[PDB]
Design a protein around this ligand. Structure first.
Ligand SMILES: [Mg+2]
Lengths: 179, 234, 155, 60, 181, 175, 126, 314
C-alpha cells in the first residue's frame, strides 16, 4: 500500500521523530520568525488560542492547510497564568485509559501541582485539535513549535524572540463548555 | 516509443491503437486522473508519456535487469542486411540471375519484392549504420556491397530501387518528431556508400605464413569486382 | 491559435466513396469548402478506402494526435467536431477550478513575505498626552482645579 | 456506441495512423476539386448513371 | 498610459512618473474575478469570439502598479485592458454520479466545462484626478504639497497604561520617509 | 440496471491490489468513491474552501490591526465589490494594494452616493409644435448620447460635440 | 451531524457605539506606514492611492531592524533575517532551492581535515 | 576596492550568494583580471582553483549571454577537462570541435518539439560523429527510448552498476548523460574520502566514461552548455543539475524515458522533501508543464518524481 504497515512505534527503539528537525515535503522552516508570549495575567485558554494560531501558521495570509509552516512561540511565565474564579478548583481534565477502569477525572489544580507546563500543553492540544484531528502528522507537528517555560528564564536569547503584543478582545472570563 | 517500436527495429507498431491483441481494452494502466475513463486525452505528449512508459518491456526493449542486444555493431547489422537477401531471392534463383530477361512472372515479383524490402530495412538500419562506420571492420564494410549485390540492388553513387524517393505531398507526409524517418534516403545512402568506400581504403592502407598471403591476394581481388558492380573504383 | 499561428496542421479524413454511410460524403460535399476557405493553413488529407475508419483526426504542431468518433454522425456534427479540432492547442487539460483559472502565478508589486509588514507598529491619529510631562501653568491650574473639586465634594 | 453515451468519443488517438498511404491518399485541393463519392444528399447507394445504367429516353 | 489629467499641474507632474511600469488589473468576467498581468493567461468561461481575435475588457475593478493603486468603487473608467483570444475548448471532465440507494437508477453526468482561454496584451491607464484627498478628516484638500504628509501619524505610549504590552522600542519610535519627494 | 461497469472498468489502475485485480470488487470501490466525491463536492467543499479564503483574508487584515469582521462591512459600505477570492489574491500577490484597500476602508472618505433615479427633462413638457423641426427633448437626449460616445477613450471623431450633432448636414446635398 | 472543523476568525475588539454614528468607519488602521498612502479623488468616484514600492517598505523594515539591533548587536536570527530582507529587495527572480543547500555543499570550507586527503579549490592531478 | 592583487577562489565562491547586481558586475571584472594573471604565472593550482569557484560564480549570474561569452573566451571547457584524471583525449576534442558544436545548439530552449517539427518539415522539401553534447544532439535524444542520467554517488564500493549501464549503450535505444558536475564530483572524491575503496572505484569510473565519450556513445553536458540550460541566476551543483536536466527533458522531450543512476543513500533521490524551496507562492504543482517557468520550479511537486525513474541495473 502507500502508507506502510511496518510503522514507527513508541516501543520500537528507532523512536519517534521530532518534526522540528525533520525534513519533509510539507515542512517549511525557511520563512518562520520567533515570537515571545508573556503569559502573566492572561487567561490560560486565550493564550492557548493565540499560541495555537501562531504555531499552526494560520496568522499568515498565505497559510495553506496541507503545508505546515508555523512560527515558534516562546510562552513564558506559565506559572502566572490566570484562570478565572472557581475554575482552577472546578474545571475537569478527563482521560480514559484502555484497561479495566477507564476514568481519570483530574482537577486543574492537580495538573498544576504536577506540571504547570502540562496545562498549557493541554489547552494547546485542544486548540490545535479543534481544526486538525483526522491526520496524526497534522495534529502533532505544530505542537513542537511551542516552547513552554514556566518562568522568565529561557535558552532562546539567540533567536531574538519579538514580544508578541496582544490584548484579548473578549471581555468576559473564559467559560468551560464541554459536553 | 519506449515499449512498441525502437530506433532500429523492423516492426511497425502502432502504440496508440492496439491492433495485435485478442481482447478489448479493459484496464488502462498508466492513468493520471479519474477523468481518463471516458475521455483519456491520449495523443497529448504528457499523457502518452504516462501510458507508453508504463507498458511492459518487450523482446525489443530488453528491460533494465535483463541483458540487451548489441545492435549498433556494424558487424551485426551487415549480416542482418544480408539475411534479408536470401529471404526474397533463393539460391537457385540467384544462380539463374547471375548468369544474365526470361523468368517466371511469379518469380519476377520476388525480385522486385526483394528490392522493396531491402530498401525498407536499409531505411530502418541506417540511423544505426551511420553511428557505427567508425569502429566497423574490414569484412563488414565490404559486406555492405556484398549484401546489396545479393539482393540485386545497385547502390546510388550518382537494377536500382534506391535512387527515387517514395512519392507523397510534403503537407500530407508524416513529419511527427520522435519517429526516426529519414526523408532523404538516396541522398544519405549515397554519402553512406561514399563514406564506407573511403573507410575501406583507410583499412587496406592499414593492412599493408601463407594465410595472410592468400588472404591479401583474395580480398584485394574482391574489392574491385564488388565495388565495380556498383560502379565504384578503389 | 497562438501568436498568429494555428496549432493545427493536418486533418485526416477517411471515407468510402461507394459503400454506404453517406454522412462523410455529405460533409465533403456541403461543409468542407466552407471550412477550407476560412482556415486555409490547415492541410486536409482525404483517404478513400473500402472499410473506412469513421473517426475524424487532427494533428497538431507539437506532434499530437486528437480524434473524434464520427460514426453515423450528421455532417453538422462532423463540421462542429472539426471546428473543435482547430480551436485547441492540445497542450493540456486542466480542470476548471479556482486555482486553475490563472495558468501561471505572477506578482507585479511583489509576493508577500513574512518580513515586509513585520516591523510596523500600531499608531495613533492625534498625538499623545504623555503621562510624564511638564505641565504648563494653565494645565496646572485646571488639574489642581479638578483635584480640589473632587476633594471638596467628597469632604 | 450511442451518440449521447460517453463510450462514444473514445479512442482519442490511434484511430488513424498519422501518415498517408502513398497510392490512394491525396490532399483536398479546394472548391474547384471534384471528390469521388461526394454528394450533398444522404445517398446510401451513391450510384451514378455509369455504374447503374438506366434505360429510358430521358434521365429522370 | 494618455497620462493622468488634473486641473492642478503640480499633482500631474508629481504623479506622472508614478504610473510607469507593469500594471496589474482586477477584472470581472462571467461572475469570476481575475488578477491580470501583461503576459498572463487566464481561462474565462466561454465567450463567443473567434479564435485569434483582439479583445478589450470592460469591467475593471482595480488597477495598480508597483507604485500607484487605483481602487475602483464599483468600476473604473479609462482603463484599457487588451487581450487576445487564444483557445476555445472544453476542459477536464468532472464526472458527477447520481445514485439513489432505494432505486435502481444510476445517472452519469459528464461536465466538461467549456472555456475561452485568453492571453493578455496591454494594460494602459489614464485617470482623471480631481484633487488630493484628506483621509483622516474627510475633505478634498485644496492645496497640494508633496513634502508634507497629508495626515501625520503619532506613536502610542501615554505612560497612562501600565499593562500596555511593550513591543521593542525601535518599532514604537520609527518615523517613515517622505515618498513623493 | 445500469451500474456503469464499462466506463469504470478502465480506471482500475488507480486502485491497489484486491480491487485492481478482481473486477466487481474494484467496480464497487469506484462506484463508491465517485458517488461519495460527487455528494461531497456538491454540498460541502464549497464551504470548506470559502472558509479557507475567509481565513486568509482575515489574517491578512490581522497584520493591519483589524479583521474580517470590519473589512467585510466596509467593503460593502464603499461599494468595492471585491470577491473574497480576489481579496485573497490581493493579500498574497499584491500586499500594497490590499493595504490600500484596508486604508480606503479605515479613512473617512465619503462612500459613493446611491445610484440616481432616471429623471424627466424639463423640455418634455414643452408642447410641440408651439403654434421640419425636432422635439427639444429629443435633441437634448441626442446631446446626452453624443457626449457619452465622446466619453469612451480617444477617437477620430474628435472631442467637439456641436458639429458632431450637426454631422447630418455633410451628407446633405444643398438644392 | 458532525462537529464543524472549518477555521474560525479571531475575535476583534468590541465597539463603544461610537461606530454607529455615520462618518466613522469601524475599521481602525493607524499604522506606521499609514501616512505614506496618499489618497486622491478620481473623476469616476473611485479613489487613487499613492504608495511606496515593495523594496522601499522592506528597506524601511531593514532600517528599523538595524536600528533596534545597534545597541545589543545582531543575533543569529537577526543575521538571517537581515540577509533575507537584503536578498528580497534585490531579488529580480524567484528562489526555488533551499537556503541551506549551498552551505551543506560548501561545508568543506568550514571544517578542514588532515593534509593527506585535504580538499582544495583544485584537486585532480595535484 | 583594492587592486594590486588577484582575487583568490574563496572570494568568488563568496560573491555567488549576493543578489546585488553591481557587486557581481564588479566581481566579474575581477575574475577576468585574476585569470589572466594566473595564466601569466603558469601555475595550475591557482588557475584551476580559480576555475571551480569561478564556475559556481558564473552559474550565479542572471544574464546568460555574458556568462556563456565569458566562459568561452576564457576557455573553461578545455582547461577544466585537462584537470581530471582520465578525461584528456575528450579535452582536446572539444577545443577542436566547439566551433562546430555551437552551430547545432538551438536559439531557444523553449518549445523544443515545435522547433524540431519545423526542422522535420524542411527535410521533406526538395557522418563523422562529433562529441556528444546534449544541447546540439537534442534531435538524437528523441530517437532514443531511454536516458540514464549519471550521478556520482553510484561510485561507492563498486563500479559494476555503471559498467552495466554502458552495456546498454550499444543497444541503440539508450544513452548516458554525463555532466561536468558529476565529472568534477568524481574527481574531487577520487582524491578525498574516508576510504581507499571508493577512490579506486571513482578512478576507473572516469576512464570508463572517458572511453565512452571518446567512442561517441555517451553524451556530455559541458560547462558552457550547462550555463545555457539552467535557469537564470540559480545556483547549480551535482545535485540540482541532475534535476535541471531531468526536468528539462521531462518538459521538452516528453517521450524519452528518464532513468536516474544513484545510490540508495543519496539525498538527491527525493528532490521534493530535500532540495526544496520554502513555501513559495510563485510556483505550483503544474509548474513543470508550462514553458515560461524556470526549470527549478519543478521540484516542489511530486510530478517531477512521476516522470523520472531511478533504477539499479545489475
Ligand atoms: Mg460548488
Amino acid at each position: 500500500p502507500f502508507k506502510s504497515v511496518l510503522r514507527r512505534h513508541k516501543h520500537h527503539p528507532e523512536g519517534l521523530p521530532l518534526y522540528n528537525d525533520m525534513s519533509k515535503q510539507w515542512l517549511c522552516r525557511e520563512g518562520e520568525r520567533w515570537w515571545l508570549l508573556d503569559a502573566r495575567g492572561e487567561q490560560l485558554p486565550r493564550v492557548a488560542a493565540v499560541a495555537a494560531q501562531y504555531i499552526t501558521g494560520q496568522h499568515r495570509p498565505d497559510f495553506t492547510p496541507g503545508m505546515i509552516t508555523g512560527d515558534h512561540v516562546v510562552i513564558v511565565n506559565i506559572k502566572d497564568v490566570v484562570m478565572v474564579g472557581d475554575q482552577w478548583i472546578r474545571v475537569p481534565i478527563t482521560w480514559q485509559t484502555a484497561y479495566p477502569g477507564g476514568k481519570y477525572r483530574i482537577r486543574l489544580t492537580d495538573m498544576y501541582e504536577r506540571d504547570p507546563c502540562m496545562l498549557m500543553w493541554w489547552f494547546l492540544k485542544d486548540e490545535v485539535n479543534r481544526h486538525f484531528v483526522r491526520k496524526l502528522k497534522t495534529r502533532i507537528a505544530p505542537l513542537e513549535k511551542a516552547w513552554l517555560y514556566e518562568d522568565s528564564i529561557h535558552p532562546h536569547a539567540d533567536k531574538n524572540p519579538r514580544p508578541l503584543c496582544w490584548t484579548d478582545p473578549e471581555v468576559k472570563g473564559w467559560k468551560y463548555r464541554d459536553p | 516509443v519506449y515499449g512498441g517500436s525502437g530506433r532500429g527495429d523492423l516492426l511497425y507498431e502502432n502504440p496508440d491503437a492496439r491492433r495485435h491483441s485478442g481482447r478489448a481494452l479493459g484496464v488502462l494502466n498508466g492513468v493520471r486522473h479519474s477523468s481518463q475513463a471516458t475521455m483519456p486525452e491520449s495523443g497529448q505528449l504528457y499523457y502518452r508519456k504516462l501510458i507508453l512508459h508504463s507498458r511492459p518491456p518487450n523482446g525489443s526493449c530488453a528491460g533494465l535487469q535483463r541483458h540487451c542486444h548489441d545492435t549498433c555493431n556494424w558487424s551485426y547489422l551487415i549480416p542482418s542486411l544480408h539475411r534479408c537477401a536470401e529471404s526474397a531471392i533463393s539460391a537457385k534463383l540467384w544462380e539463374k540471375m547471375c548468369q544474365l530477361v526470361n523468368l517466371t512472372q511469379y518469380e519476377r515479383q520476388r525480385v522486385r519484392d526483394g528490392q522493396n524490402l531491402y530498401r525498407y530495412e536499409v531505411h530502418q538500419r541506417l540511423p544505426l549504420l551511420e553511428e557505427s562506420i567508425g569502429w566497423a571492420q574490414l569484412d563488414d564494410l565490404l559486406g555492405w556491397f556484398r549484401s546489396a549485390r545479393r539482393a540485386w540492388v545497385r547502390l546510388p553513387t550518382s537494377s536500382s530501387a534506391m535512387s527515387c524517393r517514395l512519392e507523397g505531398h510534403a503537407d500530407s507526409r508524416d513529419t511527427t518528431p520522435g519517429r526516426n524517418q529519414v526523408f532523404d534516403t538516396p541522398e544519405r545512402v549515397e554519402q553512406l556508400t561514399e563514406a564506407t568506400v573511403h573507410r575501406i581504403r583507410e583499412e587496406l592502407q592499414r593492412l599493408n605464413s601463407a594465410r595472410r598471403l592468400a588472404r591479401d591476394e583474395e580480398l584485394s581481388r574482391c574489392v574491385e569486382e564488388e565495388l565495380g558492380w556498383h560502379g565504384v573504383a578503389l | 491559435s497562438r501568436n498568429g499561428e494555428l496549432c493545427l496542421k493536418k486533418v485526416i479524413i477517411s471515407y468510402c466513396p461507394s459503400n454506404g454511410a453517406p454522412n462523410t460524403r455529405q460533409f465533403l460535399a456541403t461543409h468542407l469548402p466552407h471550412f477550407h476557405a476560412k482556415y486555409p493553413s490547415v492541410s486536409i488529407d482525404l483517404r478513400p478506402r473500402l472499410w473506412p475508419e469513421m473517426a475524424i483526426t487532427g494533428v497538431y504542431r507539437d506532434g499530437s494526435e486528437r480524434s473524434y468518433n464520427t460514426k453515423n454522425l450528421s455532417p453538422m456534427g462532423i463540421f462542429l467536431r472539426l471546428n473543435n479540432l482547430v480551436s485547441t492547442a492540445n497542450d493540456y487539460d486542466q480542470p476548471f477550478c479556482a486555482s486553475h483559472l490563472h495558468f501561471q502565478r505572477r506578482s507585479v508589486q511583489g509576493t508577500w513575505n513574512p518580513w515586509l509588514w513585520n516591523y510596523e507598529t500600531e499608531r495613533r491619529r492625534t498625538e499623545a498626552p504623555q503621562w510624564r510631562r511638564k505641565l504648563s501653568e494653565k494645565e496646572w491650574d485646571y488639574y489642581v482645579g479638578q483635584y480640589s473639586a473632587q476633594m471638596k465634594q467628597e469632604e | 456506441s450511442s451518440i449521447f453515451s460517453p463510450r462514444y468519443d473514445w479512442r482519442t488517438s490511434g484511430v488513424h495512423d498519422i501518415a498517408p498511404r502513398d497510392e490512394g491518399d491525396f490532399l483536398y485541393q479546394g472548391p474547384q476539386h471534384v471528390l469521388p463519392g461526394a454528394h450533398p444528399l444522404p445517398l446510401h447507394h451513391p450510384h451514378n448513371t455509369i455504374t447503374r445504367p438506366v434505360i429510358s429516353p430521358y434521365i429522370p | 498610459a494618455n497620462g493622468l489629467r488634473c486641473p492642478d499641474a503640480l499633482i500631474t507632474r508629481t504623479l506622472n512618473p508614478l504610473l510607469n511600469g507593469p500594471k496589474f488589473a482586477v477584472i470581472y468576467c462571467g461572475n469570476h474575478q481575475y488578477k491580470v498581468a501583461v503576459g498572463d493567461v487566464i481561462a474565462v468561461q466561454r465567450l463567443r469570439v473567434e479564435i485569434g481575435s483582439h479583445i478589450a475588457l470592460k469591467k475593471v475593478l482595480m488597477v495598480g502598479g508597483p507604485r500607484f493603486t487605483a481602487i475602483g468603487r464599483p468600476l473604473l473608467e479609462g482603463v484599457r485592458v487588451t487581450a487576445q483570444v487564444e483557445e476555445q475548448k472544453r476542459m477536464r471532465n468532472v464526472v458527477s454520479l447520481f445514485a439513489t440507494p432505494g432505486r435502481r437508477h444510476v445517472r452519469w453526468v459528464d461536465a466538461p466545462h467549456a472555456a475561452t482561454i485568453i492571453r493578455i496584451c496591454e494594460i494602459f491607464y489614464s485617470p482623471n484626478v480631481v484633487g488630493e484627498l484628506d483621509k483622516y478628516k474627510g475633505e478634498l484638500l485644496e492645496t497640494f504639497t508633496p513634502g508634507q504628509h497629508t495626515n501625520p501619524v503619532y506613536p502610542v505610549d501615554d505612560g497612562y497604561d501600565v499593562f500596555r504590552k511593550k513591543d521593542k522600542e525601535a518599532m514604537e519610535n520609527a518615523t517613515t520617509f517622505l515618498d513623493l519627494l | 440496471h445500469y451500474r456503469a461497469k464499462l466506463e469504470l472498468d478502465r480506471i482500475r489502475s488507480m486502485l491497489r491490489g484486491r480491487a485492481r485485480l478482481e473486477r466487481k470488487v474494484g467496480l464497487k470501490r469506484l462506484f463508491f468513491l465517485m458517488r461519495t466525491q460527487t455528494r461531497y463536492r456538491v454540498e460541502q467543499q464549497a464551504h470548506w474552501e470559502r472558509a479557507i479564503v475567509r481565513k486568509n483574508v482575515d489574517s491578512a487584515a490581522r497584520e493591519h490591526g483589524t479583521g474580517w469582521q470590519h473589512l467585510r462591512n466596509e467593503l460593502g459600505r464603499q461599494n468595492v465589490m471585491l470577491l473574497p477570492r480576489s481579496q485573497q489574491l490581493l493579500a498574497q500577490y499584491e500586499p500594497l494594494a490590499f493595504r490600500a484597500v484596508v486604508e480606503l476602508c479605515a479613512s473617512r472618505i465619503p462612500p459613493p452616493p446611491p445610484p440616481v433615479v432616471a429623471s424627466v427633462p424639463e423640455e418634455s413638457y414643452t408642447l410641440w409644435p408651439p403654434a421640419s423641426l425636432s422635439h427639444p427633448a429629443a435633441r437634448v437626449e441626442l446631446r446626452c448620447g453624443v457626449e457619452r460616445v465622446l466619453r469612451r477613450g480617444p477617437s477620430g471623431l474628435g472631442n467637439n460635440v456641436n458639429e458632431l450633432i450637426d454631422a447630418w448636414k455633410e451628407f446633405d446635398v444643398s438644392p | 451531524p458532525k462537529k464543524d472543523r472549518r477555521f474560525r476568525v479571531q475575535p476583534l475588539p468590541s465597539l463603544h457605539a461610537n461606530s454607529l454614528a455615520d462618518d466613522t468607519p469601524l475599521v481602525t488602521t493607524t499604522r506606521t506606514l499609514s501616512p505614506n498612502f496618499r489618497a486622491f479623488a478620481l473623476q469616476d468616484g473611485g479613489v487613487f492611492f499613492t504608495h511606496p514600492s515593495h523594496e522601499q517598505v522592506m528597506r524601511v523594515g531593514q532600517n528599523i531592524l538595524a536600528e533596534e539591533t545597534k545597541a545589543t548587536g545582531m543575533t543569529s536570527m537577526d543575521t538571517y533575517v537581515n540577509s533575507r530582507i537584503q536578498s528580497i529587495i534585490a531579488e529580480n527572480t524567484v528562489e526555488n532551492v533551499a537556503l541551506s543547500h549551498w552551505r551543506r555543499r560548501h561545508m568543506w570550507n568550514l571544517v578542514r581535515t588532515h593534509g593527506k586527503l585535504q580538499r582544495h579549490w583544485g584537486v585532480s592531478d595535484a | 576596492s583594492d587592486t594590486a592583487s588577484p582575487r583568490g577562489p574563496d572570494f568568488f565562491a563568496a560573491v555567488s550568494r549576493t543578489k546585488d547586481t553591481p557587486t557581481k558586475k564588479r566581481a566579474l571584472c575581477l575574475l577576468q583580471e585574476a585569470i589572466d594573471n594566473a595564466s601569466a604565472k603558469a601555475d595550475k593550482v591557482t588557475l584551476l582553483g580559480l576555475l571551480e569557484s569561478g564556475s559556481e560564480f558564473l552559474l550565479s549570474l542572471v544574464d546568460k549571454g555574458v556568462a556563456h561569452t565569458f566562459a568561452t573566451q576564457n576557455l573553461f571547457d578545455y582547461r577544466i577537462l585537462n584537470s581530471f584524471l582520465h578525461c584528456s583525449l575528450v579535452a582536446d576534442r572539444l577545443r577542436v570541435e566547439q566551433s562546430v558544436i555551437t552551430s547545432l545548439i538551438p536559439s531557444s530552449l523553449r518549445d523544443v518539439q515545435v522547433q524540431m517539427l519545423m526542422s522535420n518539415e524542411r527535410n521533406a522539401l526538395n557522418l563523422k560523429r562529433p562529441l556528444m553534447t546534449m544541447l546540439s544532439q537534442l534531435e538524437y535524444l528523441n530517437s532514443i527510448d531511454s536516458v540514464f542520467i549519471l550521478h556520482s554517488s553510484l561510485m561507492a564500493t563498486s563500479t559494476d552498476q555503471l559498467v552495466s549501464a554502458v552495456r546498454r549503450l550499444p543497444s541503440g535505444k539508450d544513452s548516458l548523460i554525463v555532466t561536468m558536475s558529476c565529472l568534477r564530483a568524481l574527481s574531487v572524491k577520487s582524491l578525498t574520502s574516508p576510504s581507499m575503496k571508493e577512490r579506486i572505484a571513482c578512478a576507473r569510473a572516469l576512464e570508463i566514461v572517458s572511453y565512452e565519450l571518446e567512442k561517441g556513445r555517451a553524451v556530455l553536458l559541458p560547462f558552457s552548455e550547462e550555463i545555457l540550460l539552467h535557469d537564470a541566476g540559480a545556483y547549480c551543483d551535482e545535485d540540482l543539475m541532475l534535476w535541471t536536466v531531468a526536468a528539462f527533458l521531462a518538459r521538452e522531450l516528453p517521450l524519452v524515458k528518464v532513468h536516474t543512476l544513484m545510490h540508495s543513500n543519496c539525498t538527491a533521490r527525493t528532490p521534493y522533501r530535500f532540495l526544496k524551496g520554502g513555501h513559495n507562492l510563485l510556483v505550483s504543482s503544474r509548474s513543470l508543464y508550462d514553458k515560461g517557468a524556470p526549470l527549478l520550479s519543478s521540484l516542489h511537486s511530486k510530478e517531477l518524481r512521476l516522470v523520472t525513474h531511478n533504477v539499479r541495473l545489475r
